Design a protein around this ligand. Sequence first.
Ligand code: ZN
Ligand code: ZN
Lengths: 633, 485, 590
Amino acid sequence: MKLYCLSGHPTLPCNVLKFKSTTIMLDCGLDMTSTLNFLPLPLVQSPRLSNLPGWSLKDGNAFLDKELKECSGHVFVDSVPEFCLPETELIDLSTVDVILISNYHCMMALPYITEHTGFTGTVYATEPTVQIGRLLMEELVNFIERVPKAQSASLWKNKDIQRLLPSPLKDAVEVSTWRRCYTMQEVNSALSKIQLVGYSQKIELFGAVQVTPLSSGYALGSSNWIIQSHYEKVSYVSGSSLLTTHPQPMDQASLKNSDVLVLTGLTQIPTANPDGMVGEFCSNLALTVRNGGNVLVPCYPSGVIYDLLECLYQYIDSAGLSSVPLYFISPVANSSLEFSQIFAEWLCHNKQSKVYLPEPPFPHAELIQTNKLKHYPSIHGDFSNDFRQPCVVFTGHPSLRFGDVVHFMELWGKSSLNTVIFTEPDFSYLEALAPYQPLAMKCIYCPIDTRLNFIQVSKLLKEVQPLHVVCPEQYTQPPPAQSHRMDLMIDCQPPAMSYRRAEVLALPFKRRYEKIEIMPELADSLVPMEIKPGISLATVSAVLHTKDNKHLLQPPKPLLSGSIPVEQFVQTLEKHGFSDIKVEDTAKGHIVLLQEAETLIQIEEDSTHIICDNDEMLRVRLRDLVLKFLQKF
Amino acid sequence: PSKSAALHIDLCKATSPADALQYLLQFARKPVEAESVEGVVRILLEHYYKENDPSVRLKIASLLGLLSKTAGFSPDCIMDDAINILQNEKSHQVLAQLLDTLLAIGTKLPENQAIQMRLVDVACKHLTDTSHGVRNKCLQLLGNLGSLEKVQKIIGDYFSDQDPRVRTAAIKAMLQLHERGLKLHQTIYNQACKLLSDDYEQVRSAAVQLIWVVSQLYPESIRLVDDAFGKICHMVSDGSWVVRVQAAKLLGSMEQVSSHFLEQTLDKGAFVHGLEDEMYEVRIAAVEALCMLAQSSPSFAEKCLDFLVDMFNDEIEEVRLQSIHTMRKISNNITLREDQLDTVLAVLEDSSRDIREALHELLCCTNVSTKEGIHLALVELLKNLTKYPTDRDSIWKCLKFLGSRHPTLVLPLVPELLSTHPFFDTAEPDMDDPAYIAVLVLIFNAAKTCPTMPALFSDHTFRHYAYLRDSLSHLVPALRLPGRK
Amino acid sequence: EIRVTPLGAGQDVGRSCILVSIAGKNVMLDCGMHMGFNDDRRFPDFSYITQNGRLTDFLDCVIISHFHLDHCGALPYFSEMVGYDGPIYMTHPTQAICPILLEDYRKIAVDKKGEANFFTSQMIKDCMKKVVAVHLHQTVQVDDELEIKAYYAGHVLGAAMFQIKVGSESVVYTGDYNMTPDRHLGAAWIDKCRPNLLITESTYATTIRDSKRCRERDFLKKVHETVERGGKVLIPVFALGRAQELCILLETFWERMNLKVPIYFSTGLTEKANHYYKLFIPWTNQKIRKTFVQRNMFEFKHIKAFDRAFADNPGPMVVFATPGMLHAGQSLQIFRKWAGNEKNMVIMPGYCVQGTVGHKILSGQRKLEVLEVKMQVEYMSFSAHADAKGIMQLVGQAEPESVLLVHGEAKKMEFLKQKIEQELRVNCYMPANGETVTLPTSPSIPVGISLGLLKREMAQGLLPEAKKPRLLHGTLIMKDSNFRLVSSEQALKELGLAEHQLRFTCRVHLHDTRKEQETALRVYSHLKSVLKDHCVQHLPDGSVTVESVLLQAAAPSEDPGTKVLLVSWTYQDEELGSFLTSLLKKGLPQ
Ligand SMILES: [Zn+2]
Ligand SMILES: [Zn+2]
């Protein structure tokens, strides 16, 4: 019953679980914060990025002038951005049997583990999760592909170079395990081994275990999983929004009567207020378009931008700003809005009741019959002859290192008239502006997070209280920013547990009570033999048919208990025909003698001892006589 | 040096889950030793072998197997691993570590006899665990360690064990035994034909392969390949799609079959259901199967012909491209009576550049026996030209090969295709119009063999032949015209 | 014990109602309308189960297969006056599409009879409120042991077969599945789950359908010949149904041939199809889950809009109007308007129900009130039901312990039974209208077990001592909340009556002239020789160990012709001790 922890980032987790015989590896998150350590990838070269001073160590021995280059007191390594994979060498991942996927945010690491290990098993996920995961995979591989960069940087990974590097480059874990991006073939192959599961589909694995999802509400298609036998249940929650959102609401019913409630995937910033925070979004967006000038929004193709669009649409009807247009620039844009439109039964119950009426669930359709939202695959085409200053532009990857976001982060990043609106968590705000400083572009950190914070985490834990709690130390230890306050933590009173990156934890509950099935002939060939009130007993003897990890019982030793009374023994011997039987007493037992069959029997406390002659019928008669004056176990 | 320093640091730190796991991970991730001293470091691995916390021991022996993968050590590491397996047999994790080390050592370099593949196999067979601890992986151990070219009984009685995972690994061991030869027996056919209905996934997708391999071994059961192929066709109708891919592909590995039962696949039913179910996997596997069994069977080919003309509206460019391929491979002594309209209107698409060039490759290798088919093909390809003035060289090649393949069918077309009015003078057409050039290159490629064709031209047509011969010598062939002798 | 009773669709089509009882749970499988005669006998007799009383106490949950009028037909009558405040479990697309379709049939009924007794709109909305929507492959617990489970079938949009689990007993109702894949619908898939009873449809079982391309090439060449003669192809087909497959088929033909014909579409449910297939692609085939980003395949650039005044147009005219059975009236307005004409063409879409015009023309007669037949007909069969090959596929893949054939007619009933008994050897039965088919199912009892018992069991079992009775043991305890089987010594330590170590001893009295040490050696040799495969050893102090049996040479007795040998054993080898005493009574060799 072993939890192997392979990911150190709190909300992009990977956890192998050796249960009965299964090796269920929950979630495959690809840590993209490592990509923040590099230079961006512009589709057309800028004079600013090309002409930057190369940093030199004070020793001067290494040829790291061409390796890493500095900008405004911050240095970055100049190559293709690397990706922080989990340990594929802690355990042999070909022995991983079934991979479970919670959401599309923890699916980006799937091609690495599924085509560079030997994993011959199957991966299970909900079909919204696989569709938006496919579109995000194509997004990432297209943006990393467009203008190729060769990994010419290698010497910064050795130990003495990296401890002689300055900050933030010291803050990097296992740079040797970082691997370049993945290609078309393992995109196609990684989405072939996947299978389509439904929300709380009672699905069995290998005849041994049961897995099932639940609604999470973190995103469209997000799932919280349960691995259970009939007598134990370990549940894995990764991302939930019990705050009012668009997808199907969180389930609180299959979480209870469980022992482990692993708290993967909480909020990035506990100190937030999403309704007022998107109010702040509408406020500064309105201010910037009112002064006259575009706004830049780094965004994923899916997720929270959908919610943003809704309120932004509404805010037009409150602002009288129908003149400014809305642009969505992404190579998966039309398919993203399509899959937003279609995956509708997985939304809320009242949103399902909106699907009852023939109306589009997501209101960006109403944005496109009003000619407000314009989606384009790329700048290479229809965007050139339709662009309108000022605008609201939604761009590529929010890490600010690859996509079309780098082009609009240049060009327009020269005047204080414009602003860029960072809205998505798990990417550091000041670190994203680090290659772009010095800079006059207005910046507002306005992050919208839907994941539950520590107050409702406490409510969840006091609602469906487990036997054990598993979480990283970032939930136990006070956060590095607001370390001065104790309040926003995990607040439970069992001893909670803490896992770091690449750690082994034994779950302290032992399997002891398993399950067996009986065919009815044996069930009818059993008798109850009630001896002590309330507590029945029965003798069972069979053979056990073994098949498909669900054991049966088919037809093809019970022992004795209870001290025998000597007086009743000699009385029933006298009444059965035996005669001239003499009894003498000792300190603790009795010696009884039958002259027939030359029999001497001694009785003591929890002890009987018969001694007979060469007889058979009297011997077995004494056997059935003494075994019927007691209780069988 | 470095290995000794790392061992000293690990012994000095001696933290249970902290120092050991991090030190082993750093040793693996940093660099390879690439020296014989790593074998001495294996002795250092023997130093930490006698310790608690078996996860650290599993990681250490995984590092030992990784070091064995570098071919630094040889028989000493094998003896040490055998001693560790015979001594440190403690639960599934250490069993996994020991068997992974044994698997690495067996395929490290030698793969030879004299206690290099026989003693290790005997130790693996003598150490079968009680529940999944080594079972699947000791079966693949005894797989990759072939004893002698004579041991199949232990695999044979393990076709009906408990775990389906162990069934799959026994299957993979049977695969790797066949890939080394070993002269497989006949009872494997019986154990395989009772293995189709395992009532669970991931075994049938390989049970079909076992049926294929023991069927193409030799066809002697009562007739053997017909019953096996009928079982495969029954497995085509399975609900799961991976087993359908495996069944279609592994029947596409077959090459011999009875003829009559092969026509029985389409009437009274495998290919009538084997196409229209799933994505390009099942369809491409089934049509590569019909490629090979139209190549092997000179008969039957009208049936695969009209079972390919229906599947033009599959809305997949890959399916269209590989469908053009799957009928261009089988275009030998096959004509198109009525099924030529769809295959010439299939060109009508917005760009389809690879599809279009594949279609031009198809049109130049096809055979047809009608005249109106030639008329419709020419007018449709000229409409293609007038809609896309981009690929005139490709159509010049395919029209050249179409004229060269069959000259006879286009003799009545020449009085109709070009202006040859009996009494009115035929005006000289535009020479630089690159559409009259295509019908000329058809005409003069079809004029090489038939003698009754020089009398049907006009004077401007001979001067056009003169310029086409002198300009495009790789398109029009040399003729015996009196104008150009 | 499981009981099943067809309140319709046994030897019939229409009014498809099944009541199943499993372990005291009453589940309603499907409810539709007879699609036929105008009397009171198109709605099922509800008094058969309750007469004058409530149905909530008897029936637990309500299951609907799909939105056909013989399967989503008689919903308002359960909900309002016969009354059912309980759940109506049915899928999302079927819940989207039944209300407008039964509203359309309300329009037909009030246009036909002018009757206010059929139903109203407030009450059908009341029926629609208390409906629980069911997803794709998905469990729903009804109260506390009754699981319901919905699997994709492919008959119409949102067409699913259902599965019901009570404890460990399962019943599978398959409404109108099609194993043959459709163009915008897929195939049927049920995981083999040892089902007890399979309620299967057998509409098409006399005939084996060919490939699909035979169906559309025949239909398309006949349509092409009809429009070549100037005939006007009027398809009497119903709503969504096979309507949009024939739409996309005709659209493909008219766009690849570029021939001009003013095709139209029926009123009422006109754009409802357009917004209903564009919100339920995940229930459709995998071709259009991937090929929908380009344009709307479900929006048609060649179809147009019909109304009452376009029926008199000459020229080519390929329009279809509801229903498929020719019983609504607007299609009957078209048919009666177009009765005396040889140049045009009507058709039938699929199967037909008794008493309607569709079956009446299927027989092949003339008069209809009389409307003499001047049209031409051809049995085109796009109506998506599985053939006998589909019966083979679904039954052999599910491999049930019993089947039940509904939704069909008698000749193929007997044919399909006799086929199923001759090949798969399963108890195939005839259901009819009203009788109760009873299957005594095998009960199942799950108990627990200790980890150590199975640990030593697998340790002994994987050792080469199999294929013989190993005779496992243990004891079973009643708490009436769980039924527990526990190993023996653990039962000793939990009931607290202690380990009762047993010493059964007996003196073998041997009457022979051999010495007592030689007698003990003879006993050891005899027990080693007779007891094959027994651990028979001789102790250094003159004793013999046979497993857990100890034989000692005791002191001599007062009889010189009698020698005493103590034999001691425990109860775990009681049979071994009895056999040893029997053999030593039989006598040592001398
Ligand atoms: Zn139906
Ligand atoms: Zn029906």
